[PDB]
């Protein structure tokens, strides 16, 4: 009926506490959000299910 709701701080995954990396991750634009939206969508659907 459900699976474990998983959320990721994408920025912590990719750039783990580095300001330099995080400033480089901005050069990829919205992908850090687009992933968090998709995972939050999955997580809400577990309560719906």
């Amino acid at each position: 009926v459900s699976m474990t709701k998983t959320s990721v701080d994408c920025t912590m995954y990719i750039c783990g506490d580095s300001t330099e990396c995080s400033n480089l991750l901005l050069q990829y634009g919205s992908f850090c959000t687009q992933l968090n939206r998709a995972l939050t969508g999955i997580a809400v659907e577990q309560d719906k299910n």
């Binding site: 701080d9 920025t11 912590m12 506490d17 968090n36 939050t40």
Partner: protein, 49 residues
């Protein structure tokens, strides 16, 4: 304030009734420590250079 941070995350001046994920948080480092072994003696760079 947290409401303005939602208006930001949603790119809208009006917010519908809900719970909204916004900019994640981390406890910041309070101080820095450095721990190298207490070797006192400068290296023999003399007779090599």
């Amino acid at each position: 304030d947290p409401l303005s941070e939602t208006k930001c995350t949603l790119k809208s001046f009006t917010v519908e009734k809900g719970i909204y994920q916004t900019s994640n948080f981390r406890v910041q480092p309070t101080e820095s420590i450095v721990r190298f072994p207490n070797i006192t003696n400068l290296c023999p760079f003399g007779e090599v250079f």
